[PDB]
Antibody, heavy 214, light 214 residues
Framework: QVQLVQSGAEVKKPGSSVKVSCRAS???????????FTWVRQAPGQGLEWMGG????????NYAQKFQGRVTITADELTSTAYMELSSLTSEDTALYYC?????????????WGQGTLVTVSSASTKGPSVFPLAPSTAALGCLVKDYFPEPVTVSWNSGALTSGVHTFPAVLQSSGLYSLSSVVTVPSSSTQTYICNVNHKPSNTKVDKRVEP | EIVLTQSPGTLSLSPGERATLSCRAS???????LAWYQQKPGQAPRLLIY???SRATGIPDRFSGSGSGTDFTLTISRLEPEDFAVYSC?????????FGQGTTVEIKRTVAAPSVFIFPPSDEQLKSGTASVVCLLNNFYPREAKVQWKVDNALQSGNSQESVTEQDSKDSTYSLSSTLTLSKADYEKHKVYACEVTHQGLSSPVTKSFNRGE
């Protein structure tokens, strides 16, 4: 009943390199240099993608053409840590990165997975959001969380009171390299009512409560 | 290299139905060396089938796998609410150990035409040199929807980005938000801003619009 745990999310600039570590939590893991370790990534909106693997005992590595020479998988017997290093990072590397292994020293069915390490590549810098209202004109309204970095942000409505009819959409990468996001709510046309969304970007310690008036 | 292709792209079924997923191999593949995975939202991938037909430990009996040669299938006898997720097939016979593009199992329901709303830019964002008009498609099904930005009956492109929510847990619906982003200089050289929406639930395409000085 092995369980894998991965290191935390990392924000990198183009041209840099990153190293992600996979470990086993508890005493469920056995010898790390014993099993074959596989790394796969998942670009946004795309399907799973095999990057490469490492044989358990002899540690012979195999990579996919699209990453040849760009990636190094490794495993530390002494610390019981599996690593993946990807250099020359490109904005096309922004994706979820998974660690996996099977039961034997040779590659096979991936029985165990980590919860994923998100690696975001943006030449941007930590930047709090600007919140603009989406004024009403049943009715709809919301808040626009524009040009922030990096994810995520939390949107409430009337400090958590209003929670019905609400849709907070997933963020979107614009050319500018910053995150833009929308949060809406549908309300009775006959309302009188006063609405405010509460945006919070943790990195930048930004707390924003903008009202929406027609 | 062995290429896997999965079918269908999206599988729309109801709770309780049987689901049949397909994985096609570019060349003959011994039964062994084909595994299936489950990607529940926000979670790590999970092994269901290895060796093409062998259930993995702790896997409910309603998952099964068969197939030989190029054609392999995953069967979910009776769909449970927690079975609506993304399934991927993986080959580990040779290298590279390729994946399929994934097949999305979604909850099927009655056609629901969207409610279309359009929001003009905030007069505050206009104090900055930028303007963002937001089109929102609310509570529709199926997910297929085309949103066309028409600035004075001119089809835009490259200047809009859109996001789609998950299939809602309660009403099994989708919602979509599109953002057309211009500069105040250009924004102020046009009069009509329209969101043209086409959805199988609509007799005809719907167009929501406003004029700049409204």
């Amino acid at each position: 009943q092995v369980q894998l745990v991965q290191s935390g999310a990392e924000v990198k600039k183009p041209g840099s390199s990153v190293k992600v570590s996979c470990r086993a939590s508890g005493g469920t893991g056995g010898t790390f240099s014993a099993y074959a370790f596989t790394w796969v990534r998942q670009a946004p909106g795309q399907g799973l993608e095999w990057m490469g693997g490492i044989t358990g005992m002899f540690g012979t590595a195999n990579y996919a053409q699209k990453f040849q020479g760009r990636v190094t998988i490794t495993a530390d017997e002494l610390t019981s840590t599996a690593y993946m290093e990807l250099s020359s990072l490109t904005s096309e590397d922004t994706a979820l990165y998974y660690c996996a292994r099977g039961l034997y020293y040779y590659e096979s069915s991936l029985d165990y997975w980590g919860q994923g390490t998100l690696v975001t590549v943006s030449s941007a810098s930590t930047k709090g959001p600007s919140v603009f209202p989406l004024a009403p004109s049943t009715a709809a309204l919301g808040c626009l969380v524009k040009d922030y970095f990096p994810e995520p942000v939390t949107v409430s409505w009337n400090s958590g009171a209003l929670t019905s009819g609400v849709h907070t959409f997933p963020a979107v990468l614009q050319s500018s390299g910053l995150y833009s996001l929308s949060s809406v709510v549908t309300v009775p046309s006959s309302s009188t009512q006063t609405y405010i969304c509460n945006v919070n970007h943790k990195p930048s310690n930004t707390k924003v409560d903008k009202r929406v008036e027609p | 290299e062995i290429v896997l292709t999965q079918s269908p792209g999206t599988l729309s079924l109801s709770p309780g139905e049987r689901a049949t997923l397909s994985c096609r191999a570019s060349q003959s593949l011994s039964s062994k060396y084909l595994a299936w995975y489950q990607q529940k939202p926000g979670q790590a991938p999970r092994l269901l089938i290895y060796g093409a037909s062998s259930r993995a430990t702790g896997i409910p009996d309603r998952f099964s796998g068969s197939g030989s040669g190029t054609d392999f299938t995953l069967t979910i006898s009776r769909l449970e609410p927690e079975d609506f997720a993304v399934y991927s097939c993986q080959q580990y016979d040779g290298v590279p150990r390729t994946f399929g593009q994934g097949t999305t199992v979604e909850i099927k329901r009655t056609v629901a035409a969207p409610s279309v709303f359009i929001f003009p830019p905030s007069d505050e964002q206009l104090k900055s040199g930028t303007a963002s008009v937001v089109c929102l498609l609310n509570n529709f099904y199926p997910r297929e929807a085309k949103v066309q930005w028409k600035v004075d009956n001119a089809l835009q492109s490259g200047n809009s980005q859109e996001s789609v929510t998950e299939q809602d847990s309660k009403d099994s619906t989708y919602s979509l938000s599109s953002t057309l982003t211009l500069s105040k200089a250009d924004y102020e050289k046009h009069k009509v801003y329209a969101c043209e929406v086409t959805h199988q639930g609509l007799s005809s395409p719907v167009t929501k619009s406003f004029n700049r000085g409204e």
